[PDB]
Design a protein around this ligand. Structure first.
Ligand SMILES: C=C1/C(=C\C=C2/CCC[C@]3(C)[C@@H]([C@H](C)[C@H](CCO)CCCC)CC[C@@H]23)C[C@@H](O)C[C@@H]1O
Length: 240
């Protein structure tokens, strides 16, 4: 029941992801060396992982079918607000339930609760984050489903600052209606049960994680000594 345009959207976003995500995580070796002893001894390293990811989320965003049609300003608005949610999403791909940590190959680049807490974030935001990571992992989404959710997360009309929300909406609907149809045809039961409703619910959780983030970030940035460990990209994107 899938059209060729939808088949096209799937081919695009999958390739677009493969271009923006490295399963070897070889680039992780360029980041500032991680230190586990230790006040914020991980902010330097993880600050680079985030900023690296932000770049890769932008490249993925550009390849979003129809995203180019948006006005330069809206594109600035969507990514500035989705960047963090998209990161938390694309992170799930390396998240494991075996020990509740992000595993990116070597134990050196394996991140757990104490590493995120050692980056300047309390358990108040880490707890709901890991919960989100588990619930999103339980879904066992297909890669086709994974890549769509990320895109739909990018082009959201209700993002604060959006002007051409209707056109932003026309694009999200086209992607969304692609996800719905895919789950019907391509995703067999029981794993297909309410699969869509559960994916949309995760975007509602990200709005929450994002809201507690941009908040807990302003307090992490109040000290020019912490905002001195970040990268120019992280500062420019997560507000100054
Ligand atoms: C960044 C990624 C990866 C893992 C993500 C992590 C592990 C370390 C800690 C990170 C950077 C978290 C970071 C401390 C968060 C944002 C701070 O600006 C903490 C707030 C939680 C909402 C978010 C994603 C986490 C690896 C791979 O899946 C690629 C992906 O882009």
């Amino acid at each position: 029941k899938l059209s060729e345009e939808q088949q096209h959207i799937i081919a695009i976003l999958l390739d677009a992801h493969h271009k923006t995500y490295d399963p070897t995580y070889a680039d992780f070796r360029d980041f500032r060396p991680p230190v586990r002893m230790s006040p914020l001894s991980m902010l330097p390293h993880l600050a680079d992982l985030v900023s690296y990811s932000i770049q890769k989320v932008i490249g993925f965003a550009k390849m979003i079918p129809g995203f180019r049609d948006l006005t330069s300003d809206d594109q600035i608005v969507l990514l500035k607000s989705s960047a963090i949610e998209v990161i938390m999403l694309r992170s799930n791909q390396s998240f494991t339930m075996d020990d509740m940590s992000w595993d990116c190959g070597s134990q050196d680049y394996k991140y757990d609760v104490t590493d995120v807490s050692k980056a300047g974030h309390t358990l108040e935001l880490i707890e709901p984050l890991i919960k989100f990571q588990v619930g999103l992992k339980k879904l066992n989404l297909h890669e086709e489903e994974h890549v769509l959710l990320m895109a739909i997360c990018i082009v959201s009309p209700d993002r604060p600052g959006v002007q051409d929300a209707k056109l932003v909406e026309a694009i999200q609907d086209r992607l969304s209606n692609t996800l719905q149809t895919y789950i019907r045809c391509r995703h067999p039961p029981p794993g297909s049960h309410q699969l869509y409703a559960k994916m949309i619910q995760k975007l509602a959780d990200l709005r929450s994680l994002n809201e507690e983030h941009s908040k807990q970030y302003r307090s992490l940035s109040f000290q020019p000594e912490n905002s001195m460990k970040l990268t120019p990209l992280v500062l420019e994107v997560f507000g100054n």
